[PDB]
């Protein structure tokens, strides 16, 4: 019974590999490579949009705390749902069909998010865009694997991981070239406003549309047809692959020699039942040790990588904040009287001042604090305030005309006979401000990805030469050693170098994990299992981000120990996995 | 009302601390340190006796399954009752009074257990010995804390755990030096027998007697007298402390400068009511968050620690059992006839044999199984049987002379005209049996405690330097990381190293928890609350042991996940506790 099933699946796999050797590589494989690289580029772009627009988003939607912290977790949760959903649906509907549906959903909801003005609606649109793009990596890898021969199956799959990095580079470049133009205030409707970050979101929603356009021209994988008892169109697809390959070779004169490939409301409930059957069969007697080791490896690597990747920029920001706090100026004791006096003062503290009959017209305040001051018959006009506070201050007969000094900028103050007139529009809470730091953020991201590059090249070249397990274990161990090396970092330059090193060493491990998870599952459960594991990866990413953003400024022992321990456990479970190099893809 | 009570308690605490600073440290504090360390040594010794004597105990009391599994739970339940009882009674009768009572109870019932011959009576005696020793740690910590000044209150209390450490070493040494002499068969009465494990139990009951002898010479804590409205003898005790301290210094000429100190069946029933009230008042408006966080931390830490600590030796035993089974031999089909044939065969299976007129004189059988055999006019003499069975066997005209082949060793057998003569004395049920493994058990226990040592030293040195909460949380997190590291264990050596690591990392956390629970309760509820929490610790120990002994041989994921989750929850609730370093003991 079950033995017969396994046997027949075995000669099916062998015959399919023979047909693939007959067809060979050439134009078809590379064409599909680029076509799927567009979807991976979209996946890579999607994880940078909210991170890049949080400043402007909180400016134009008046976002408080616990709202900026949810806008990254929203995309990660969206991918967590979408990966599982589309991975489950791909084994019953098809790789190309589900990829088209998911990419279309992503594009539509990304456009809609680009045009949303509210916050809750923005959360919903971002979550659904993440759902749409969540099933990109599983379907792409499981769809490209079914067109590659046994020989160079690792190198030909590892070159497919350049596109995530290219998407990251694209996002960084567009953010640098679009967002810095804060002047843009395109108007459509009194109640609504359109700034430049919306344009950035639009441009970052573009490449998914190109992915759909390229994918509509590609044929469904023959293996999916063969599994589901559909023989004729599988043969047609294989013939198309052969014809394209040989026309590209220049001998477009031979004929495909294969005639045949040996073959062995209510609707919603049926689909649910079938998907649950596939998911449970993933937890079968045949697939249990492999499944659990894969779960462990995916979870640990995701936790460590995402935790450190979010930790490095936060630590850079913290070091800059410490420098700023160290440079401040203090002016203890002042007595200014009867003068019109503006200024553009930044990063200052005034204590013990006594101001009488002073006119403050047209001044910019950035990180300026007045403490223990007294203002008496003063006058504030055209005051622009950023990170400015009044603590232990007393105001007597003062007038605030055309100022943004809201109620939250007076901390434990006392106003007597004070008048507020023509208050500027603004947030009811400190929303902080990001200025010149954006350029350095973009530069840091670009450096991270460029550091990723050499590991990609080396892993792609040596994946077949040394092996999947050797690559995975080697890169995991090197990453753990780097995690130890994070102790020797206390400046921005050192943190950038550490980011570069860790990003450059972990990518080989991720490449090996992708190829491994491709090769250890049969063609009737590849997308389901690999999508489930990628959903677990996204959940671990959420957990790791939450855990690692809490150690910035406390100590550097907790991040190092957590990352090193998780990576060591991941390498330990990775060394127990079966070897799949030199094996027919079955 | 209540505010006045809190205030007056406050200046009482402040004046008491001033008096303690005036008295200082010296000979009195170290003398009391050793005196209470004897009681902690007794506590440490008590938890090894049944574990060390279960082999010999089941040999000489014929213990079945469900009886060896209850002889550990009996001591844990005894301590669970005793901790609560003596902690409750200590706040109404006194620390030294209740410690004397509990230690005497422990000693008496330990001697009686040493001389018991039955099982039920042995259960009762061990349970009451556990009850006697249950209130050791609460009263000892809460009694020593009331003689220490603010300055080094953490260091001087953390040195108090080297004692439970050594007790373990003492128990291991005595077990190694006493039990291996199985020859000892001291006889007193025909129906009763005295082996060497009884001598071991006697020697392990000794140190409680020394604890009582040393405790009878120490004075009651002044704080207990001051709380209960008794002023004169509190002043006398403080004067004694001062006099001893200054005589030790070498200046026995100064005078105690303190003259006045601020002061705040039916009998048994009243005391019980008072205890109940104190406990309910713990479910006080002032102490409800603290109480619940303490409950959670104690329960989780006890569950994890005890579960893993019982899991490690069980896993070692399981690995040894697997190795032994992997050594097995099968001899299918035999025909032996007309020969005198002994042997010393271990771990074998004979199937399909046919024996005719065979004499079996003086053979040792260990883990030997005869299946589908036929014995005809056979003769068994001086047969020693261990884990030996006869299944689906037929005996015809066979004689069993001077053999221990009892009725339970013939499984679904058929005897025809068989004769049993001069059967050896022995159990009516299988008892298995432990030989050389005892030395390795003792060595493993010794290694565990020696691994505990460095954590003790470091915690004692750094308790004041870093803080109680930092120490607790740090050690809890490291313990969780170790729980993750239990994945890398598959041999006896690896399991021993893992036991050493986990024991070495959890002890700082336990030290910090003890000191913390000492310092967050007022002197009129210290013993009640701390004893209630220690009773909860023992109940959690029972639950954790029962849960964790069921995962041995199934998988290593359930233990790791349970322990890590519980320790993470414990650390989470530990980080929310108030800081008590740099605070007057109130
Ligand atoms: C280029 C790396 C890429 C991969 N396929 O390994 N990565 C890294 C983490 C998430 C992801 O898709
Ligand atoms: C002597 C240490 C003692 C304590 N009170 O901290 N321990 C450690 C593990 C369980 C226990 O009671």
Summarize the structure.
Chains A, B: Interacts with SYT1/synaptotagmin-1 in a calcium-dependent manner. Binds the adapter protein complex AP-2. (Microbial infection) Interacts with C.botulinum neurotoxin type A2 (BoNT/A, botA). Interaction is improved by glycosylation of SV2. 2 copies of one chain form a homodimer. Chain A has helices at residues 2-23, 27-46, 49-61, 70-93, 95-115, 120-134, 136-144, 153-158, 162-178, 196-215, 222-227, 232-249, 266-282, 289-326, 437-466, 468-485, 492-519, 526-548, 557-574; strands at 186-187, 193-194, 329-340, 344-371, 374-376, 379-386, 389-391, 394-396, 399-403, 410-411, 414-416, 419-421.
Structure description:
The structure is a homodimer of 586-residue chains. Chain A is an alpha/beta fold. Helix content of chain A is 62%, strand content 13%. Chain A has helices spanning 2-23, 27-46, 49-61, 70-93, 95-115, 120-134, 136-144, 153-158, 162-178, 196-215, 222-227, 232-249, 266-282, 289-326, 437-466, 468-485, 492-519, 526-548, 557-574, and strands at 186-187, 193-194, 329-340, 344-371, 374-376, 379-386, 389-391, 394-396, 399-403, 410-411, 414-416, 419-421. In chain A, strands 3, 4, 5, 6, 7, 8, 9, 10, 11 and 12 form a 10-stranded parallel beta sheet that branches. In chain A, strands 1-2 form a two-stranded antiparallel ribbon. In chain A, strand 1 and strand 2 (193-194) form a beta hairpin. The site of one (2S)-2-(2-oxidanylidenepyrrolidin-1-yl)butanamide has 7 residues of chain B, from helix 17.
């Amino acid at each position: 019974g079950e033995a017969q099933r396994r046997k027949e699946r075995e000669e099916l796999a062998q015959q399919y590999e023979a047909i693939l050797r007959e067809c060979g590589h050439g134009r078809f494989q590379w064409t599909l490579y680029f076509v799927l690289g567009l979807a991976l580029m979209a996946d890579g772009v999607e994880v940078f949009v909210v991170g890049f627009v949080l400043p402007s988003a909180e400016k134009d939607m008046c976002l408080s705390d616990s709202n900026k912290g949810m806008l990254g977790l929203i995309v990660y949760l969206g991918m967590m749902v979408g990966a599982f959903l589309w991975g489950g649906l791909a084994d019953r509907l098809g790789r190309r069909q589900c990829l088209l549906i998911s990419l279309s959903v992503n594009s539509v909801f990304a456009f809609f998010s680009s045009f949303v003005q509210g916050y809750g609606t923005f959360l919903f649109c971002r979550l659904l865009s993440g759902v749409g793009i969540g099933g990109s990596i599983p379907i792409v890898f499981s769809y490209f694997s079914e067109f590659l021969a046994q020989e160079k199956r690792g190198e030909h799959l590892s070159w497919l991981c350049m596109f995530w990095m290219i998407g990251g580079v694209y996002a960084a470049a567009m953010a640098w070239a679009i967002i810095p133009h804060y002047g843009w205030s395109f108007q459509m409707g009194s109640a609504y406003q359109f700034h430049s970050w919306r344009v950035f979101v639009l441009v970052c929603a573009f490449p998914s549309v190109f992915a759909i356009g390229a994918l509509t021209t590609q044929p469904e994988s023959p293996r999916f047809f063969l599994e589901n008892g559909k023989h004729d169109e599988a043969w047609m697809v294989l013939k198309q692959v052969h014809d394209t390959n040989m026309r590209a070779k220049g001998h477009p004169e031979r004929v495909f020699s294969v005639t045949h490939i040996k073959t062995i409301g209510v609707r919603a409930l049926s689909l649910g039942g079938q998907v649950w059957g596939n998911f449970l069969s993933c937890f079968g007697p045949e697939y249990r040790r492999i499944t659990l080791m894969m779960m462990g490896v995916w979870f640990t690597m995701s936790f460590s990588y995402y935790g450190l990747t979010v930790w490095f920029p936060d630590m850079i920001r913290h070091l800059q904040a410490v420098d700023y706090a160290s440079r401040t100026k203090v002016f203890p004791g002042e007595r200014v009287e009867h003068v019109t006096f503006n200024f553009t003062l930044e990063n200052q503290i005034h204590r013990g001042g006594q101001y009488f009959n002073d006119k403050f017209i047209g001044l910019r305040l950035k990180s300026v604090s007045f403490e223990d001051s007294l203002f008496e018959e003063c006058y504030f006009e055209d005051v622009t305030s950023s990170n400015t506070f009044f603590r232990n201050c007393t105001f007597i007969n003062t007038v605030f005309y055309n100022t943004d000094l809201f109620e939250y900028k007076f901390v434990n103050s006392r106003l007597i006979n004070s008048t507020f007139l023509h208050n500027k529009e603004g947030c009811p809470l400190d929303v902080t401000g990001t200025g010149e730091g954006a350029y350095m953020v973009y530069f840091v991201s670009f450096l991270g990805t460029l550091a990723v590059l050499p590991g990609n090249i080396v892993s792609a070249l040596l994946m077949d030469k040394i092996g999947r397990l050797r690559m995975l274990a080697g890169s995991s161990v090197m990453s753990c050693v780097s995690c130890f090396f994070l102790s020797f970092g206390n400046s921005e330059s050192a943190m950038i170098a550490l980011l570069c090193l860790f990003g450059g060493v972990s990518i080989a491990s991720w490449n090996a994990l992708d190829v491994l998870t491709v090769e250890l599952y049969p063609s009737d459960k590849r997308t389901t299992a690999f999508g489930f594991l990628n959903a677990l990866c996204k959940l671990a990413a959420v957990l790791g981000i939450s855990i690692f953003t809490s150690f910035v400024g406390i100590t550097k022992a907790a991040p190092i120990l957590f990352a090193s321990a998780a990576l060591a456990l991941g390498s330990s479970l990775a060394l127990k996995l079966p070897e799949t190099r030199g094996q027919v893809l079955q």
